[PDB]
Amino acid sequence: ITVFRMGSEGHQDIDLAILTALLKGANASAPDQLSLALAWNRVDIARSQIFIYGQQWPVGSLEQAMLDALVLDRVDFVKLLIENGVSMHRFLTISRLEELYNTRHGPSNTLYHLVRDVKKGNLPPDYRISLIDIGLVIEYL
Amino acid sequence: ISKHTQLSPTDAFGTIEFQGGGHSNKAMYVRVSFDTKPDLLLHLMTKEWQLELPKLLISVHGGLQNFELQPKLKQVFGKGLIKAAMTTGAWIFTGGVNTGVIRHVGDALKDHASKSRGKICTIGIAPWGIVENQEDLIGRDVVRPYQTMSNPMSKLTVLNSMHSHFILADNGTTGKYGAEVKLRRQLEKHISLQKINTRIGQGVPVVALIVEGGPNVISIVLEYLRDTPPVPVVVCDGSGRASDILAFGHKYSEVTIQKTFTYTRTQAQHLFIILMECMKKKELITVFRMGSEGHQDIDLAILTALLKGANASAPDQLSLALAWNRVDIARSQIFIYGQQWPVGSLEQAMLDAL
């Protein structure tokens, strides 16, 4: 139970009060709270509630969070994770780049049409785009 | 063993770039032993690192434990420290690792760099055995990346970013504290004895800043006071630890049951000897408080300590202010009611200022 009041309570905003109840009330780990905040597209909540003194993050959780934030076009979350120890020199690999190039959780783009035109309209439906096709598209453009 | 090691030359000196933080900082690092003479270190800092002699030296001490500070107190402290270090050419000596007050000064430097020009010379003197990754720091005269991300289970502390230079002190042991205090003290003493460009005869002034602290902080401040050239001390009352008890003892001085705070072995252990020595040499000690008294600015508090703490004449204070290029300090502190200036001092000051 989380009571509300306009006086002594720091959470004088019901907007802050409602969201904080779902975080501490779930009794979930830091990755789960970060995933919920990323889904809600609330970066202030993650900055204030999640990233605190000694969160003892597990090994590889922040890289997975960065991978999940990149495909969702969450620029503020990418900046926050970069500010919290995540380095792109070790995060980025060929496999992760290919996974990024084959995402669907974002605004529509015209990449597939260019790939089909370059490949002379021979790709089958549900085609797996590789880095060589991207290189061919770049050379054509 | 009795510190039985091999006196081999250093195999680690160069530049490290921190990967993981939100900024791009380059820190020159050199590892040495604890027996290195201060003169050679000063020569290395003045020539290899291309650092001119400072006009002020700030020594920051605190509690090595990872404490926390009240909001709006760590902001004014950071603003005052940054302004004092930026307005004049000063050096800042810290532990170097990312624990305690060093994290707060790193945050203050983080805020400063994004909102202003110029550079601040912050030097960290840390033991070699405590760095989390002793390896990946061996490339001599080369750039080697360093990872800012740390994990609790490593039992070791990573080097704090936003530090311009490092001097790793090694004695043979690994994973233990207490191998760089003597070197830092000797380096400070040797730097103080160096003569500034003024012809009055003043040396490089030294001040000490105390936050949080602990049982060792009382001994450190007593040692600083007992030095033949007294060193002024600035204490933050809002920290909570032995700095707060130092402020508590500062008031209504020249109270044993009120002194009992269970920070030591109950009432069976009392630090009254060292505490009363410090309170006997209490004219040099300066305290700070947000709005309770004057000098609400850390920048003003630090500079005023070096003026009244030197016990020097008005020409000496004017020369120091002229060197620091602070005219407000001279207007407020120096030029006051009846300074009885000597004959010809003001003309010499005008000649030096022109």
Short mmCIF file of C-alpha atoms in Angstrom, two decimals:
data_model
loop_
_atom_site.label_atom_id
_atom_site.label_comp_id
_atom_site.label_asym_id
_atom_site.label_seq_id
_atom_site.Cartn_x
_atom_site.Cartn_y
_atom_site.Cartn_z
CA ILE A 1 0.00 0.00 0.00
CA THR A 2 1.34 3.42 -1.03
CA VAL A 3 -0.51 6.40 0.45
CA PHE A 4 -0.35 9.87 -1.12
CA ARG A 5 -0.22 13.37 0.34
CA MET A 6 0.71 16.87 -0.81
CA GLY A 7 2.86 17.63 2.24
CA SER A 8 5.71 15.61 3.74
CA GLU A 9 5.75 12.97 0.99
CA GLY A 10 8.41 13.57 -1.64
CA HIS A 11 6.16 12.04 -4.31
CA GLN A 12 3.76 14.96 -4.44
CA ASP A 13 3.01 13.96 -8.06
CA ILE A 14 0.53 11.11 -8.56
CA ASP A 15 2.21 10.44 -11.91
CA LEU A 16 5.43 9.61 -10.06
CA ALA A 17 3.52 7.84 -7.28
CA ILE A 18 1.72 5.39 -9.58
CA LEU A 19 4.81 4.35 -11.56
CA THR A 20 7.05 3.88 -8.52
CA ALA A 21 4.51 1.49 -6.97
CA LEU A 22 4.82 -0.90 -9.93
CA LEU A 23 8.62 -0.98 -9.59
CA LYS A 24 9.06 -1.63 -5.86
CA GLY A 25 5.82 -3.62 -5.69
CA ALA A 26 6.99 -6.17 -8.25
CA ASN A 27 10.02 -7.13 -6.11
CA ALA A 28 11.91 -7.76 -9.35
CA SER A 29 15.59 -7.42 -10.14
CA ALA A 30 17.22 -4.38 -11.72
CA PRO A 31 17.12 -5.79 -15.30
CA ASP A 32 13.36 -6.29 -15.00
CA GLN A 33 12.82 -2.72 -13.79
CA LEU A 34 15.04 -1.43 -16.60
CA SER A 35 13.06 -3.45 -19.15
CA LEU A 36 9.78 -2.06 -17.80
CA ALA A 37 11.13 1.50 -17.93
CA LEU A 38 12.37 0.93 -21.48
CA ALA A 39 8.93 -0.36 -22.48
CA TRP A 40 7.28 2.69 -20.88
CA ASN A 41 9.82 5.03 -22.56
CA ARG A 42 10.42 6.75 -19.20
CA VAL A 43 14.10 7.62 -18.77
CA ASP A 44 13.71 9.82 -15.69
CA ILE A 45 12.25 6.90 -13.72
CA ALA A 46 15.20 4.70 -14.66
CA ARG A 47 17.67 7.48 -13.84
CA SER A 48 16.17 8.18 -10.41
CA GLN A 49 14.69 4.86 -9.27
CA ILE A 50 16.77 2.15 -10.96
CA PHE A 51 20.32 3.49 -11.28
CA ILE A 52 21.14 4.05 -7.60
CA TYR A 53 23.93 3.42 -5.08
CA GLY A 54 25.23 -0.11 -5.62
CA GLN A 55 22.73 -1.92 -7.84
CA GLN A 56 25.10 -4.91 -8.37
CA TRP A 57 24.04 -5.51 -11.95
CA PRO A 58 24.59 -9.08 -13.23
CA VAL A 59 27.17 -9.89 -15.91
CA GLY A 60 25.97 -9.02 -19.40
CA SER A 61 22.69 -7.39 -18.36
CA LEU A 62 23.66 -3.89 -19.54
CA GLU A 63 24.75 -5.12 -22.98
CA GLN A 64 21.40 -6.89 -23.41
CA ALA A 65 19.64 -3.70 -22.31
CA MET A 66 21.61 -1.71 -24.88
CA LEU A 67 20.71 -4.23 -27.59
CA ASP A 68 17.03 -3.99 -26.64
CA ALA A 69 17.16 -0.18 -26.59
CA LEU A 70 18.89 0.14 -29.97
CA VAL A 71 16.13 -1.71 -31.84
CA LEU A 72 13.41 0.38 -30.15
CA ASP A 73 14.96 3.75 -31.17
CA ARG A 74 15.37 4.83 -27.53
CA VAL A 75 18.11 7.45 -27.84
CA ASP A 76 17.91 8.63 -24.23
CA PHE A 77 18.27 5.08 -22.92
CA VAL A 78 21.29 4.52 -25.17
CA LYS A 79 22.86 7.70 -23.80
CA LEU A 80 22.07 6.67 -20.21
CA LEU A 81 23.59 3.20 -20.69
CA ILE A 82 26.68 4.72 -22.32
CA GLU A 83 27.01 6.99 -19.28
CA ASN A 84 26.86 3.89 -17.02
CA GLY A 85 29.87 1.85 -18.12
CA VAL A 86 28.64 0.41 -21.43
CA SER A 87 31.30 0.67 -24.15
CA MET A 88 30.61 0.29 -27.87
CA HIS A 89 34.10 -1.06 -28.63
CA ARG A 90 33.25 -4.31 -26.82
CA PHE A 91 29.46 -4.38 -27.26
CA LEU A 92 29.33 -4.21 -31.05
CA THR A 93 30.08 -7.40 -32.99
CA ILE A 94 29.21 -8.82 -36.41
CA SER A 95 26.33 -10.89 -35.01
CA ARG A 96 24.87 -7.96 -33.07
CA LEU A 97 25.19 -5.68 -36.11
CA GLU A 98 23.37 -8.24 -38.27
CA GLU A 99 20.64 -8.54 -35.64
CA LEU A 100 20.32 -4.75 -35.69
CA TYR A 101 20.03 -4.75 -39.49
CA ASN A 102 17.16 -7.28 -39.34
CA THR A 103 14.95 -5.63 -36.71
CA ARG A 104 11.29 -4.64 -37.02
CA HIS A 105 10.57 -2.58 -33.87
CA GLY A 106 10.92 0.82 -35.50
CA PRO A 107 9.66 3.25 -38.14
CA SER A 108 9.24 2.00 -41.69
CA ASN A 109 12.23 2.24 -44.02
CA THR A 110 13.01 1.58 -47.69
CA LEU A 111 16.03 -0.70 -47.15
CA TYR A 112 14.31 -3.89 -48.34
CA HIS A 113 13.28 -2.33 -51.66
CA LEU A 114 16.88 -1.26 -52.31
CA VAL A 115 18.15 -4.73 -51.40
CA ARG A 116 15.62 -6.36 -53.74
CA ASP A 117 16.54 -4.01 -56.59
CA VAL A 118 20.27 -4.64 -56.10
CA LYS A 119 19.76 -8.43 -55.99
CA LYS A 120 17.84 -8.21 -59.31
CA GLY A 121 14.59 -9.28 -57.67
CA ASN A 122 15.72 -12.82 -56.85
CA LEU A 123 15.50 -12.89 -53.05
CA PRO A 124 12.91 -15.29 -51.57
CA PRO A 125 10.30 -14.07 -49.08
CA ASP A 126 11.54 -13.90 -45.48
CA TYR A 127 15.13 -13.30 -46.56
CA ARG A 128 18.01 -12.97 -44.10
CA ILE A 129 19.98 -9.81 -44.87
CA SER A 130 23.75 -10.12 -44.43
CA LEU A 131 26.52 -7.52 -44.36
CA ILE A 132 27.54 -8.26 -47.95
CA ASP A 133 24.12 -7.13 -49.21
CA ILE A 134 24.49 -3.94 -47.15
CA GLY A 135 27.91 -3.40 -48.71
CA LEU A 136 26.48 -3.86 -52.20
CA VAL A 137 23.70 -1.36 -51.40
CA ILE A 138 26.27 1.15 -50.13
CA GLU A 139 28.38 0.71 -53.27
CA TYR A 140 25.31 1.22 -55.46
CA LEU A 141 24.23 4.34 -53.55
CA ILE B 1 58.84 -11.08 4.43
CA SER B 2 60.46 -7.77 5.39
CA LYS B 3 59.52 -6.00 2.15
CA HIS B 4 61.95 -8.26 0.28
CA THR B 5 61.31 -7.36 -3.37
CA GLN B 6 63.37 -6.88 -6.53
CA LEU B 7 64.42 -3.32 -7.40
CA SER B 8 63.65 -3.61 -11.11
CA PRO B 9 62.97 -0.51 -13.23
CA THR B 10 59.42 0.52 -14.00
CA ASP B 11 57.58 -1.32 -16.78
CA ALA B 12 54.44 0.86 -16.89
CA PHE B 13 54.38 4.50 -17.99
CA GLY B 14 52.28 6.21 -20.65
CA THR B 15 48.71 7.31 -21.37
CA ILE B 16 45.40 5.55 -20.68
CA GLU B 17 42.03 6.36 -22.26
CA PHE B 18 38.95 5.48 -20.22
CA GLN B 19 36.31 3.48 -22.10
CA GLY B 20 32.87 3.24 -20.52
CA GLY B 21 32.26 6.77 -19.32
CA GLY B 22 30.30 9.52 -21.01
CA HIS B 23 33.40 11.60 -21.82
CA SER B 24 36.82 11.16 -23.42
CA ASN B 25 39.66 11.78 -20.95
CA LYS B 26 43.38 11.04 -21.25
CA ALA B 27 45.44 10.49 -18.09
CA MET B 28 49.22 10.20 -17.99
CA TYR B 29 50.22 7.41 -15.62
CA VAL B 30 53.60 6.36 -14.19
CA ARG B 31 54.21 3.67 -11.58
CA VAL B 32 57.07 4.07 -9.10
CA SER B 33 58.13 2.79 -5.69
CA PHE B 34 57.43 4.46 -2.35
CA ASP B 35 61.15 5.32 -1.98
CA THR B 36 61.28 7.68 -4.97
CA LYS B 37 62.76 11.03 -4.00
CA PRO B 38 60.38 14.02 -4.27
CA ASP B 39 62.85 16.01 -6.40
CA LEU B 40 62.81 13.44 -9.21
CA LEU B 41 59.00 13.29 -9.09
CA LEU B 42 58.79 17.08 -9.32
CA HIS B 43 61.21 17.07 -12.26
CA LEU B 44 59.09 14.40 -13.98
CA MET B 45 55.90 16.40 -13.41
CA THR B 46 57.46 19.67 -14.60
CA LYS B 47 59.17 18.29 -17.73
CA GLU B 48 57.73 14.95 -18.88
CA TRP B 49 54.11 15.91 -18.12
CA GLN B 50 54.67 19.61 -18.98
CA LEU B 51 53.13 21.07 -15.82
CA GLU B 52 54.23 24.47 -14.54
CA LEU B 53 54.66 25.13 -10.84
CA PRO B 54 51.30 25.97 -9.23
CA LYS B 55 50.41 29.10 -7.30
CA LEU B 56 48.31 27.05 -4.85
CA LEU B 57 48.20 23.45 -3.61
CA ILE B 58 44.97 21.88 -2.36
CA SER B 59 45.17 18.61 -0.41
CA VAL B 60 41.87 16.70 -0.20
CA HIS B 61 41.44 14.12 2.55
CA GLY B 62 38.41 12.12 3.58
CA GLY B 63 36.91 8.81 4.57
CA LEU B 64 37.90 5.97 2.27
CA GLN B 65 34.46 4.44 2.88
CA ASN B 66 31.84 4.99 0.18
CA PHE B 67 29.56 7.41 2.01
CA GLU B 68 26.90 9.82 0.73
CA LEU B 69 26.36 13.57 1.05
CA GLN B 70 23.17 15.59 1.39
CA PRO B 71 21.92 17.15 -1.87
CA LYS B 72 22.73 20.86 -2.28
CA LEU B 73 25.81 20.24 -0.10
CA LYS B 74 27.75 18.19 -2.66
CA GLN B 75 26.79 20.87 -5.22
CA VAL B 76 28.06 23.93 -3.34
CA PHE B 77 31.19 22.00 -2.33
CA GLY B 78 31.84 21.06 -5.94
CA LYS B 79 31.22 24.60 -7.19
CA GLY B 80 33.54 26.10 -4.58
CA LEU B 81 36.31 23.58 -5.21
CA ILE B 82 36.08 23.97 -8.99
CA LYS B 83 36.05 27.77 -8.80
CA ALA B 84 39.03 27.82 -6.43
CA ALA B 85 40.99 25.41 -8.64
CA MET B 86 40.06 27.20 -11.89
CA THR B 87 40.38 30.91 -11.06
CA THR B 88 44.04 30.42 -10.09
CA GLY B 89 46.63 27.86 -11.12
CA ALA B 90 46.31 25.17 -8.46
CA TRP B 91 46.87 21.43 -8.08
CA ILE B 92 44.49 18.99 -6.40
CA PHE B 93 45.84 15.91 -4.62
CA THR B 94 43.39 13.03 -4.13
CA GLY B 95 43.56 9.31 -3.50
CA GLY B 96 42.81 8.40 -7.10
CA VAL B 97 40.54 5.38 -6.70
CA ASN B 98 36.78 5.72 -7.13
CA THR B 99 35.79 5.49 -3.45
CA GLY B 100 34.81 8.15 -0.93
CA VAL B 101 35.37 11.87 -1.46
CA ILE B 102 37.20 11.06 -4.70
CA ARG B 103 33.90 10.07 -6.31
CA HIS B 104 32.41 13.42 -5.29
CA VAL B 105 35.35 15.39 -6.69
CA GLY B 106 35.09 13.31 -9.87
CA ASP B 107 31.42 14.24 -10.17
CA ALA B 108 32.33 17.90 -9.58
CA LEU B 109 34.92 17.70 -12.37
CA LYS B 110 32.30 15.98 -14.55
CA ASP B 111 29.92 18.91 -14.10
CA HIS B 112 32.71 21.46 -14.64
CA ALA B 113 34.06 20.06 -17.91
CA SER B 114 30.71 20.15 -19.72
CA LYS B 115 29.95 23.79 -18.83
CA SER B 116 33.26 25.66 -19.09
CA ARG B 117 36.59 26.01 -20.88
CA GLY B 118 40.08 25.53 -19.46
CA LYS B 119 41.71 22.59 -17.66
CA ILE B 120 42.10 21.64 -14.00
CA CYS B 121 45.20 19.71 -12.90
CA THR B 122 43.93 16.89 -10.67
CA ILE B 123 46.55 14.38 -9.52
CA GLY B 124 45.74 11.00 -7.98
CA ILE B 125 48.31 9.20 -5.84
CA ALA B 126 47.06 5.64 -5.32
CA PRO B 127 48.66 2.31 -4.39
CA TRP B 128 49.47 0.02 -7.29
CA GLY B 129 47.93 -3.09 -5.74
CA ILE B 130 44.38 -1.76 -5.45
CA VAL B 131 43.68 -1.07 -9.15
CA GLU B 132 41.16 -3.60 -10.44
CA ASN B 133 43.12 -4.42 -13.62
CA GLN B 134 46.83 -4.34 -12.83
CA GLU B 135 47.38 -5.84 -16.27
CA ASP B 136 46.41 -3.95 -19.44
CA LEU B 137 48.53 -1.10 -18.01
CA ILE B 138 51.98 -2.34 -19.04
CA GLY B 139 52.48 -0.76 -22.48
CA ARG B 140 55.29 1.73 -21.97
CA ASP B 141 54.96 5.07 -23.80
CA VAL B 142 51.80 3.81 -25.52
CA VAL B 143 48.05 4.35 -25.21
CA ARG B 144 46.13 1.49 -23.57
CA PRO B 145 42.35 1.49 -23.06
CA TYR B 146 40.89 1.13 -19.57
CA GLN B 147 37.42 -0.09 -18.61
CA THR B 148 35.49 2.15 -16.22
CA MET B 149 32.86 -0.52 -15.46
CA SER B 150 33.44 -2.27 -12.13
CA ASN B 151 31.94 -5.24 -10.30
CA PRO B 152 31.59 -5.68 -6.52
CA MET B 153 33.12 -9.18 -6.44
CA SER B 154 36.54 -8.00 -7.68
CA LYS B 155 37.39 -6.67 -4.17
CA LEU B 156 39.41 -3.99 -6.00
CA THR B 157 38.64 -0.39 -6.95
CA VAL B 158 39.09 1.00 -10.45
CA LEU B 159 40.95 4.25 -11.08
CA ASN B 160 38.63 7.25 -11.07
CA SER B 161 38.23 9.02 -14.40
CA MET B 162 38.39 12.81 -14.84
CA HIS B 163 41.88 12.73 -13.29
CA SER B 164 44.64 14.39 -15.31
CA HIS B 165 47.59 12.42 -13.91
CA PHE B 166 48.37 9.39 -11.76
CA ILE B 167 51.37 8.33 -9.66
CA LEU B 168 51.03 4.69 -8.63
CA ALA B 169 53.08 3.91 -5.51
CA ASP B 170 54.15 0.29 -5.06
CA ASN B 171 55.93 -1.47 -2.20
CA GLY B 172 55.55 -5.16 -3.10
CA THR B 173 52.25 -5.97 -1.42
CA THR B 174 49.04 -6.33 -3.43
CA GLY B 175 45.46 -5.63 -2.40
CA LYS B 176 46.42 -3.67 0.72
CA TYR B 177 46.16 0.00 1.68
CA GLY B 178 48.87 2.10 3.30
CA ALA B 179 51.76 2.42 0.86
CA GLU B 180 51.56 6.00 -0.48
CA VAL B 181 50.85 8.37 2.43
CA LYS B 182 54.52 9.05 3.22
CA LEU B 183 55.38 9.71 -0.43
CA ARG B 184 52.46 12.13 -0.77
CA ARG B 185 53.41 13.97 2.42
CA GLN B 186 57.06 14.26 1.38
CA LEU B 187 56.07 15.48 -2.09
CA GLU B 188 53.82 18.14 -0.55
CA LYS B 189 56.59 19.24 1.82
CA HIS B 190 59.13 19.45 -1.02
CA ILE B 191 56.72 21.38 -3.26
CA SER B 192 55.98 23.86 -0.46
CA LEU B 193 59.69 24.59 0.03
CA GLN B 194 60.01 25.54 -3.65
CA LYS B 195 60.11 29.30 -4.19
CA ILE B 196 57.36 31.02 -6.18
CA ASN B 197 58.25 33.64 -8.80
CA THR B 198 57.65 36.52 -6.37
CA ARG B 199 60.70 38.18 -4.82
CA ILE B 200 59.06 38.65 -1.40
CA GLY B 201 60.17 35.14 -0.41
CA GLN B 202 56.79 33.37 -0.17
CA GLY B 203 56.63 29.68 -1.02
CA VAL B 204 53.79 27.73 -2.58
CA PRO B 205 50.90 27.82 -0.07
CA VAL B 206 49.25 24.59 1.04
CA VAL B 207 45.72 24.06 2.38
CA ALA B 208 43.89 20.93 3.53
CA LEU B 209 40.23 20.08 2.91
CA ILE B 210 38.51 17.52 5.15
CA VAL B 211 35.23 15.74 4.37
CA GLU B 212 33.74 12.81 6.32
CA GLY B 213 36.98 11.17 7.43
CA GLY B 214 37.39 8.85 10.37
CA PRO B 215 39.74 7.95 13.22
CA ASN B 216 42.76 8.56 10.98
CA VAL B 217 41.50 12.03 10.01
CA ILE B 218 42.02 13.35 13.55
CA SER B 219 45.64 12.17 13.49
CA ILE B 220 46.13 13.61 9.99
CA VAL B 221 44.77 17.04 10.93
CA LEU B 222 46.84 17.05 14.13
CA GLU B 223 49.95 16.25 12.09
CA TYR B 224 49.10 19.01 9.62
CA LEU B 225 48.68 21.54 12.44
CA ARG B 226 51.89 20.50 14.22
CA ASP B 227 54.03 21.08 11.10
CA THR B 228 56.62 23.82 11.53
CA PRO B 229 54.90 25.83 8.78
CA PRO B 230 51.27 25.53 9.92
CA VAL B 231 48.82 24.32 7.27
CA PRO B 232 45.26 25.71 7.46
CA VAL B 233 42.47 23.13 7.59
CA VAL B 234 38.93 23.42 6.20
CA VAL B 235 36.27 21.14 7.68
CA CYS B 236 32.77 20.41 6.36
CA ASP B 237 30.30 20.06 9.23
CA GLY B 238 27.50 18.46 7.20
CA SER B 239 29.46 15.31 6.34
CA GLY B 240 28.54 13.44 9.53
CA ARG B 241 31.77 11.60 10.34
CA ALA B 242 34.75 12.79 12.42
CA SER B 243 34.66 16.04 10.44
CA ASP B 244 31.26 16.70 12.04
CA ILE B 245 32.68 15.87 15.48
CA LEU B 246 35.57 18.24 14.73
CA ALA B 247 33.04 20.99 14.01
CA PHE B 248 31.16 20.02 17.19
CA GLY B 249 34.35 20.38 19.23
CA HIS B 250 35.19 23.64 17.46
CA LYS B 251 32.19 25.35 19.05
CA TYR B 252 32.15 26.20 22.78
CA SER B 253 35.85 25.41 23.10
CA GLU B 254 38.47 26.81 25.47
CA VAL B 255 32.09 17.97 27.65
CA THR B 256 33.11 14.30 27.85
CA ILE B 257 29.71 12.60 28.07
CA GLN B 258 28.54 14.58 25.03
CA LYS B 259 31.76 13.58 23.25
CA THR B 260 30.86 9.88 23.58
CA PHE B 261 29.48 8.98 20.14
CA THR B 262 30.18 5.19 19.91
CA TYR B 263 32.24 5.78 16.76
CA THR B 264 35.04 4.08 18.74
CA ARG B 265 35.13 1.48 21.54
CA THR B 266 32.12 2.98 23.35
CA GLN B 267 33.02 5.26 26.26
CA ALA B 268 36.02 3.08 27.14
CA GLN B 269 37.95 4.65 24.23
CA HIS B 270 38.28 8.44 24.03
CA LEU B 271 40.33 10.36 21.46
CA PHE B 272 40.42 13.36 23.80
CA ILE B 273 44.22 13.70 23.66
CA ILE B 274 44.41 14.33 19.91
CA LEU B 275 41.05 16.14 19.87
CA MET B 276 42.19 18.62 22.53
CA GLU B 277 45.53 19.09 20.78
CA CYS B 278 43.59 20.00 17.63
CA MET B 279 41.32 22.33 19.62
CA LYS B 280 44.40 23.87 21.24
CA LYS B 281 45.71 24.69 17.76
CA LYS B 282 42.23 25.81 16.70
CA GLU B 283 43.09 29.25 15.29
CA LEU B 284 44.25 27.66 12.03
CA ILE B 285 41.28 25.28 11.77
CA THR B 286 38.40 26.73 9.74
CA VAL B 287 34.87 25.30 9.60
CA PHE B 288 32.09 25.65 7.04
CA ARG B 289 28.31 25.80 7.32
CA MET B 290 25.53 26.53 4.82
CA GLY B 291 23.97 29.81 5.92
CA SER B 292 24.59 29.44 9.66
CA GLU B 293 27.58 31.81 9.54
CA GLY B 294 29.62 33.82 7.04
CA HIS B 295 31.70 32.44 4.18
CA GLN B 296 28.88 30.37 2.69
CA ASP B 297 31.06 29.80 -0.40
CA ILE B 298 33.74 27.09 -0.37
CA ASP B 299 35.75 29.15 -2.87
CA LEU B 300 35.82 32.10 -0.47
CA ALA B 301 36.48 29.85 2.54
CA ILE B 302 39.58 28.19 1.07
CA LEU B 303 41.29 31.38 -0.09
CA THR B 304 40.69 33.32 3.14
CA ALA B 305 42.31 30.51 5.15
CA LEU B 306 45.61 30.96 3.31
CA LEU B 307 45.63 34.71 4.03
CA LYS B 308 44.92 34.77 7.77
CA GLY B 309 46.66 31.42 8.30
CA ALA B 310 49.98 32.68 6.94
CA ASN B 311 50.15 35.45 9.59
CA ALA B 312 51.93 37.59 7.00
CA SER B 313 51.96 41.34 6.53
CA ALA B 314 49.72 43.27 4.15
CA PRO B 315 52.32 43.42 1.31
CA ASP B 316 52.61 39.62 1.38
CA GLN B 317 48.84 39.16 1.18
CA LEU B 318 48.68 41.69 -1.66
CA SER B 319 51.44 39.85 -3.52
CA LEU B 320 49.61 36.54 -3.10
CA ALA B 321 46.35 38.08 -4.33
CA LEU B 322 48.18 39.61 -7.31
CA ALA B 323 49.67 36.21 -8.14
CA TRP B 324 46.22 34.59 -7.90
CA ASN B 325 44.69 37.39 -10.03
CA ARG B 326 41.89 37.77 -7.46
CA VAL B 327 40.99 41.44 -6.98
CA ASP B 328 37.83 40.89 -4.94
CA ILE B 329 39.81 39.11 -2.22
CA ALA B 330 42.27 42.01 -2.01
CA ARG B 331 39.42 44.54 -1.98
CA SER B 332 37.51 42.77 0.80
CA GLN B 333 40.18 41.01 2.90
CA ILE B 334 43.34 43.09 2.49
CA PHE B 335 42.27 46.73 2.08
CA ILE B 336 40.45 47.24 5.39
CA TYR B 337 40.19 49.78 8.22
CA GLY B 338 43.72 50.88 9.13
CA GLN B 339 46.17 48.50 7.45
CA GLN B 340 49.19 50.76 8.28
CA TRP B 341 51.00 50.00 5.05
CA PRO B 342 54.80 50.48 5.17
CA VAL B 343 56.55 53.25 3.24
CA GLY B 344 56.96 52.42 -0.45
CA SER B 345 55.00 49.15 -0.39
CA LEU B 346 52.18 50.40 -2.62
CA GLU B 347 54.58 51.73 -5.27
CA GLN B 348 56.33 48.35 -5.39
CA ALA B 349 52.92 46.66 -5.68
CA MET B 350 52.02 48.97 -8.58
CA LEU B 351 55.33 48.18 -10.29
CA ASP B 352 54.70 44.45 -9.87
CA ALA B 353 51.12 44.77 -11.16
CA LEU B 354 52.06 46.82 -14.24
#
